[PDB]
Design a protein around this nucleic acid. Structure first.
Length: 50
RNA sequence: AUUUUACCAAUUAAGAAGAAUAUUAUAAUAAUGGGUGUCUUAUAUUUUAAAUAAAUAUUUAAAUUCCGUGUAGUAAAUUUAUUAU
């Protein structure tokens, strides 16, 4: 398995890509990782001020 | 009458489009694989899968550990955005 072997298969690097990944990723791993922008740590959640 | 010894020296101003829709970086608005001298026929032209990836991250702490390979929303669609004869 390429991921197990730690093979750097990237389209801009060698023109290859692993077949077990998803073609479209809505938000990258960094976007998923950043939790302060996802949870209610300090950010306000309802911008409407009635 | 006859006849001028042997050897030794040096590179510089360039005659005429015989040099530009040029070379490199730079545009954050396009994009189904560009192919001209091409020019029916689609049983014969199908590439999809939750993972670090043509998507790429503002600090020195603590901390697992026999050389600590290491830092968080900054604004919630907010303007750092892969641009372009």
């Amino acid at each position: 398995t390429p991921m197990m072997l730690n093979i750097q298969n990237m389209m801009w690097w060698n023109g290859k890509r692993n077949l077990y990944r998803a073609t479209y990723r809505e938000k990258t791993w960094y976007e998923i990782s950043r939790t302060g922008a996802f949870t209610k740590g300090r950010r306000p959640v309802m911008r409407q001020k009635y």
